[PDB]
Amino acid sequence: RGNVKDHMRRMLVEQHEVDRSVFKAVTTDKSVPLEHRLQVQRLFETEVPRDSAANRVVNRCVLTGRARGVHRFARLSRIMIRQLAHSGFLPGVSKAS
RNA sequence: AGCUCUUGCAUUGCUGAAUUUUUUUUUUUUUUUUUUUUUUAAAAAAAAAAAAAAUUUUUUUUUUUCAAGUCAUCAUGGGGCUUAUAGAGUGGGCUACAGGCGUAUUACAUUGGACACCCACAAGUUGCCAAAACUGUCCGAAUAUACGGAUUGGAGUAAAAAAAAAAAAUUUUUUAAAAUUUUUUUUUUUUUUUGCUGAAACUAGCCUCCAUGAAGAAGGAAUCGCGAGUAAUCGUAGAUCAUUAGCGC
RNA sequence: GUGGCAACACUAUAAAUCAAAGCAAUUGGCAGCGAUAGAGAUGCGCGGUGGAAUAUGCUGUUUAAAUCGAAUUUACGCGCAAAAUCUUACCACUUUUU
């Protein structure tokens, strides 16, 4: 399915690098500025791409277009993990016990 | 070229079910004797005897049938679509709520609740951490109990540690007593504390603390599951995950 | 036609159709036919459900959409090992390219 559209979202997290967003987040998590955090947070999460915060990423699979049931254990999805596992074309993951 | 459009009765793949049990009876090594093939030699073959035994924390693994399920896993046959069955953007909805059903959890207490304890011993030191309980103490009036913890409002708050100087022998009762030899000033100072995480938590997260405290006093007909470290009970840690699993796995 | 008191007892062919009707040993499905083995297979126990509330899934109702499949056993803590936007395919609106 649409694995690449998420890669575009990941690229927007990094083209408009998260550092710029998080540094503005630093000044809104500081209570030292008495106010203007409302002004800083008023824009700067709206001029900043709303599709670049780190929650819109949904961590899809890479083999296929799986969007549900993924694994970071070996960057694959369950049915493929089983297919590669029985094939053994994977780093030594055997049937258990 | 693209479909998340159809067709699982066109399909590959993968799985469901119970067919719940069978997966040890079989070889190999050695000995003795002997014979089959090749211009100084190995295997081979045959009669008998003895031993080695059969993978993993103990389940996986081997299994027959349902046009069983899935075209939204991808794939792909056929058909359909291409100003829309194609892509974006913003916000919903995928979680709504007479009824009814399935699966779980929590109780309806005293074999218990609470609170403390030592903060009891684990799976789990490989390139330290619990709970039930044991010991102590409070509670047993149909109280709906100090059981239970559903719904609903409301609010997001305390400190503890100790250092240096000046002074020093002060605070509190009755009509006779009491606490300090540290009282009152300045400078200090840590460690926690901040509601959390996210851009945004009303619906619709979660946390903490108040308050309101529901049913429920063990459940018919009916029925399911399981005979040893098993049921039940008790935590624990892993996944996906910004956080959300309390009950799911 | 013969016998009888008869029920009828004989003797006795065909017309007409069909392409098999049959037979014996089996090999399988039945048992409302027995002997031997095995399963909490029961009657033997424990704990559940169904009673209450919450969670959670499904139908049904409505809504603009409540996206779509799973459908008796083996569907209903199922695809979802997680939906606040995104995931998301559904709707309202505004655009885009063939």
3-state secondary structure A12-74: HHHHCCHHHHHHHHHHHHCCCCCCCHHHHHHCCCCCCCHHHCCCCCCCCCCCCCCCCCEECCC
Whole-number Å distance between alpha carbons of A45 and A53: 9
The C1' atom of B198 and the CA atom of A97 lie apart, in whole Å, by 41
Q: For residues A77 and A70, is the Cβ–Cβ distance under 8 A?
A: yes
Residue A30: CB less than 7 A from any atom in strand B: no
Breaks in chain A (C–N beyond 2.5 Å) sit after: none
Resolution in angstroms comes to 4.2
Closest CA to A28 of A55, A56, A48, A8: A48
Spell out which residues of A between 53 and 92 contact strand C, using CB within 7 Å: 55-56, 58, 67-70, 78
Whole-number Å distance between alpha carbons of A77 and A63: 7
Whole-number Å distance between alpha carbons of A77 and A69: 6
